[PDB]
Design a protein around this ligand. Structure first.
Ligand SMILES: COc1cc(NS(C)(=O)=O)ccc1Nc1c2ccccc2nc2ccccc12
Ligand SMILES: COc1cc(NS(C)(=O)=O)ccc1Nc1c2ccccc2nc2ccccc12
Ligand SMILES: [Mg+2]
Ligand SMILES: [Mg+2]
Lengths: 213, 442, 442, 213
DNA sequence: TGTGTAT
DNA sequence: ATATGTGT
DNA sequence: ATATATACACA
DNA sequence: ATATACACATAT
């Protein structure tokens, strides 16, 4: 059907099949060998994501990496999302700002077209160790720089390894994070069409205030 | 199998704030002082590293933009090539910082070759206006090898003209002249009223007229007869294909006028004849208005000055004069920092040279014994002198060539020069040094 | 518009022949001396220049092949990147001449990352075998800075295994073990009969056998019982996907076998269980043969040795033994050349050291009147003395910390010990130096 | 029509219209600036040309560069060619070995399927300068590598700028080459058919024998 | 049908 | 509706 | 960031 | 070697 979609052997059923929207092709090239036989599929996101906020569904679907995601998954733009091919979306990006601050909120805004999914927890963000340390057998896995800054002296001596993106992870670390995942479950607050119109809207004047307070 | 539950809010406040502030402060808005976006700073730092001693070498843009990842760059490698290609253009740069070699195109047809085949080097302009690079600040991050910003003499953010777009803010600065900007900075440095610098689009034989902050770019025609005119210059926005497909062809469709192409190595040059369907009212004001309105020759532009101050925060200005005054104040502070650093360095150099001269005079007079000692023995027996205790290894680390007859006189002259420059740095204030550096710009 | 007449026969005899002569001797057939195709020579030379002081630093391949063009490469930049990526493999190379860091894959999965998002450096193996590169012959081209070929100790062409097509010719050489190659080189050096080196694939748990020129590579299986067995090793040509989808699943479909994986670090292990359809015979001979043939643990590969000799022309060797014999025959001449150059170098160094010792002894004695002399007078007095006549520039250019009463006798002892390394390179032959460099191979 | 192909004003009509066959898109881009829009055409060749000798007529119109060449010129493989859209075919390959020995002879072998166009003079090679030098007070063109050594000592003063590729030529020398062409007309000898089995044929023994001499 | 250096 | 310049 | 097609010669 | 698409803001 669509290429670069690594299928899961149990796709199209009611079990917890998980899709990992890794950002790149190297991440999925590493994932294919280390993933589980079932309940694990991947689709790369090449480049930045189109803003899915405001325009019609017909015009919105005219982008490649929205038609692709709506084809791999059961997500139909203008109807309820219950008969999905998979069961959980597991968005994973790099450790840089471009990952969690541009691709991640764009995907969240696109998935906001079906708000029914958020309180079911079937959209999640896979964590990624920004800092890895090999203290002998011990594998320190710091997911944000604050933890490593606050834990630089609690351990006798460690050797850090700055992870640039998903292509800098070794096969063992990718396998560990792929069968032992640390998920961030995202839930919409009471107001969600008030910060997403703020962030993905055309009126930059709201953002003029937003980056000040 | 950890499932941390975090709200959708306080995600926009932690990473989306992080990404937007990152685009504003570190991606696509030039700093006030050096006028560089950080990617351009990485590219130019790598270019200076590649220059070393042989600065005239034309390195490829796949090499200048290939070793930037070990200086602090995180955002790929095919984007520093384009960033290095845009500052290497030989026709779109009013004050180029990278001198280039390759198919850069021209104003007639504007299409450059692939960035991987473009050769670049640091231009003479960079070594002319940028100074005190070793007195530049230090980024708080350890990985960011290049300084926080460089220290030019004039505001570079205005000369070449910039257009950066970030999240929530954007900047657009038209290309100002080098003469007008230099004159304005000289006026502001001496505490005088600052005259607005003039826009000086590169290789332009037209003229710019500012009205209500809406700078108008205008070309020039020439009526060689009653039914023939010669368009001598067209506004900077246009190229030949766009001019033909947007104005003249339609004009031909109107049938009002017929034109000919006289383009060559020089700028745009056209000829045109008028048919009966085109009005030719003898009043030259109406004719001028008609020629302007139907033959382009008028481009309206406005500035959106938005820069980053020395504190790393955004600042939106309203006039070039205020930016020039703020830049001159910050550069005066950095000039005072340079003064302090230089007086300390020259004092240290003068002590070192004085010790060298005294030791050379002692050995030429036989006061010190050179035969019979060791490393530690000689070091201990010479470092016991209080005035020789400052430097011992470097003081003794010279040659038989160095302890020569006339070399003693040469060392005395060097000490005299060190003293002279020490008094020069002790006496000279910020204004004198700044005007000396400003007058040296071509 | 001018017209000249050309014949197709002249075109093929002048133009197409030049291309045929090109991609045989200059593009895709390894030099027998060093086993490097011309692109790999450029990649290795650029890596050598990049290493400099930090030999352990990992440079990017995009920087490793982004400067071969100035080294004489006339064919692009991506081809050199791919050649370096293949060269810098970690597992496929029996004797890696380029240590690599990146996603090189393994025997289980064979796919590099991007040939640019990987790092490479000169491995310790290269600095071991490639003992001499300065004395290598110079290319006839004036723009070919890398030598004609490098000068390794053992022939590295058959160490890793080359395979290169051409026009009218092709080459295919199997990998060989370093120990067997070293033994063969030793035997060819000291005149005894040269045994055939054994084929040793990297991280290979199987065994190879020579059958009348062909090489049979056999996998290893152990029968757990009369129902199931464990395949521990497979031939080198089989990847995981190819083995699974080409010979395992086909037979598994027809009720024959039931297999499962045991891959790990030293992976490619499989456990299989025999069904009723698979008619296994209790006779061990035909059972062994049928198991070897059905699962394809048996492969046969034939060498196709065609190499560029010292003269630059193609040469075909029927046996690897003749290849090694000619290799050691020419390496004898190259090592003798190295011996002569080191003779000259040691002679010059001994002159310099003795002149330095005499100069120090004379200044300690005080006979040299350094008082009231300049550089001109110093040179005038020094060049008149015969032993100081040869060396003037660097003979009287030492730092003061270099000379000392105790370091006077220290430098005298150093000059005395210089006789030992002068005699080392004089009273020996090719056999001794070659044997010592052969013993230095781990 | 066909992309990458720049037409003329008299294509399909009686005139000495030329279809230049370059080896790179940079050459076509530079040509479009100098192309006389009524007596010049153009089409670039991306990769090495398929060896068309011995292949069936059904498997020859499968390579895109061979389909577009036969479509732009109007040449039909089977029937005689006398209604060409261009009066001349010009090969403007590079000066390197890969252009003069692989693309040029392979294109000659492909065009040999209609031998008539060889005696009419409608197929020729645009010789490309190599050793362009500032001999005397202006630029001087040398066409072969051996010609430089034939006249190296005779030049009083000069510079050297090797033409590695067709993209290394600026607009002035390209204009001189295009508006003042130097052509080499290809005439096939009596044994032309037995000379394209010796290089395009599937018998490496004859190639080995010839290469030995 | 692979295998490695070039357009 | 469109150009400009760093990112994926 | 990846995805696009050919030559060549032996097994 | 070239072709492959989107994010951002604000005049015009
Ligand atoms: C025929 O060769 C090419 C064809 C195309 N596309 S098309 C519509 O003409 O069939 C595109 C590119 C090429 N040539 C290629 C290269 C040319 C020069 C240098 C490197 C090249 N690398 C290529 C890699 C894969 C496919 C084609 C390449
Ligand atoms: C949407 O972005 C892309 C789409 C495609 N098309 S497809 C059918 O494979 O899904 C291909 C590439 C991209 N992304 C691009 C880049 C991504 C990362 C780094 C550099 C990129 N450069 C690109 C240049 C042009 C077009 C897309 C690019
Ligand atoms: Mg990144
Ligand atoms: Mg070429």
């Amino acid at each position: 059907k669509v290429h670069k979609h690594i299928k899961a052997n149990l796709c199209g059923k009611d079990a917890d099949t998980t899709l990992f929207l890794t950002e790149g092709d190297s991440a999925i090239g590493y994932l294919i060998d280390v993933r589980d036989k079932e309940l694990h599929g991947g689709y790369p996101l090449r480049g930045k994501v189109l803003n899915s906020w405001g325009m019609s569904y017909a015009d919105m679907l005219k982008n490649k990496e929205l038609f692709d995601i709506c084809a791999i998954t059961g997500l139909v733009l203008g109807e309820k999302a219950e008969n999905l091919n998979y069961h959980n979306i597991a968005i994973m990006t790099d450790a840089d700002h471009d990952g969690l601050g541009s691709i991640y909120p764009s995907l969240l805004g696109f998935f906001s077209n079906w708000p029914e999914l958020f309180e079911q927890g079937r959209i999640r963000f896979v964590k990624t160790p920004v800092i890895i340390a090999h203290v002998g057998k011990k594998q320190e896995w710091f997911y944000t720089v604050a933890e490593y800054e606050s834990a630089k002296d609690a351990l006798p001596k460690h050797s850090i390894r700055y992870i640039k993106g998903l292509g800098s992870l070794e096969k063992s670390e990718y396998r560990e994070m792929i069968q032992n995942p640390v998920y961030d479950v995202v839930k919409l607050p009471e107001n969600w069409k008030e910060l997403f119109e703020m962030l993905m809207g055309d009126n930059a004047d709201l953002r003029k205030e937003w980056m000040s307070q | 199998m950890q499932l941390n539950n975090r709200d959708l809010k306080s995600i926009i406040d932690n990473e989306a704030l992080a990404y937007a502030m990152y685009t504003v402060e570190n991606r696509a808005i030039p700093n006030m002082i050096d006028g560089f976006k950080p990617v351009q700073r990485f590219v130019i730092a790598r270019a200076l590293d590649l220059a070393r001693g042989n600065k005239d070498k034309f390195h490829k843009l796949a090499s200048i933009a290939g070793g930037v990842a070990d200086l602090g760059y995180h955002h790929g490698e095919n984007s520093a090539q384009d960033a290095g290609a845009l500052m290497a253009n030989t026709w779109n740069n009013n004050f180029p910082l990278l001198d280039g070699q390759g198919n850069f195109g021209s104003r007639t047809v504007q299409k450059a070759a692939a960035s991987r085949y473009i050769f670049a080097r640091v231009s003479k302009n960079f070594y002319n206006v940028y100074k005190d690079t070793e007195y530049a600040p230090v980024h708080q991050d350890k990985e960011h090898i290049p300084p926080a910003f460089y220290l030019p003499i004039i505001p570079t953010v205005l000369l070449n003209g910039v257009s950066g777009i970030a999240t929530g803010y954007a900047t657009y600065i038209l290309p100002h002249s080098v003469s007008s900007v230099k004159k304005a900075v000289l006026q502001a440095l001496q505490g005088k009223k600052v005259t607005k610098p003039k826009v000086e689009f590169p290789e332009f034989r037209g003229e710019v007229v500012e009205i209500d902050g809406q700078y108008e770019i205008r070309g020039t025609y020439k009526f060689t007869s009653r039914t023939q005119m010669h368009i001598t210059e067209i506004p900077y926005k246009y190229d030949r294909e766009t001019y033909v497909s947007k104005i003249l062809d339609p004009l031909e469709n109107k049938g009002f006028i017929t034109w000919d192409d006289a383009c060559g190595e020089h700028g745009f040059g056209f000829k045109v004849k008028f048919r009966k369907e085109y009005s030719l009212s003898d009043n030259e004001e109406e004719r001028h208005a008609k020629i302007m309105k139907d033959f382009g020759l008028i481009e309206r532009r406005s500035q959106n000055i938005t820069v980053i101050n020395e504190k790393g925060k955004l600042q939106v200005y309203d006039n070039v004069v205020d930016l020039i005054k703020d830049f001159v104040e910050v550069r005066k502070t950095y000039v005072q920092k340079r003064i302090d650093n230089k007086i300390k360095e020259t004092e240290s150099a003068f002590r070192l040279a004085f010790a060298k001269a005294h030791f050379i005079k002692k050995v030429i007079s036989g006061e010190i014994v050179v035969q019979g000692k060791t490393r530690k023995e000689l070091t201990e027996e010479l470092s016991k002198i209080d005035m020789y205790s400052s430097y011992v290894d470097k003081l003794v680390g010279m040659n038989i060539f160095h302890m020569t007859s006339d070399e003693a006189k040469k060392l005395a002259e060097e000490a005299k020069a060190k003293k002279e420059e020490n008094e020069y740095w002790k006496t000279t204030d910020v204004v004198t040094e700044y005007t000396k550096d400003l007058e040296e710009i071509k």
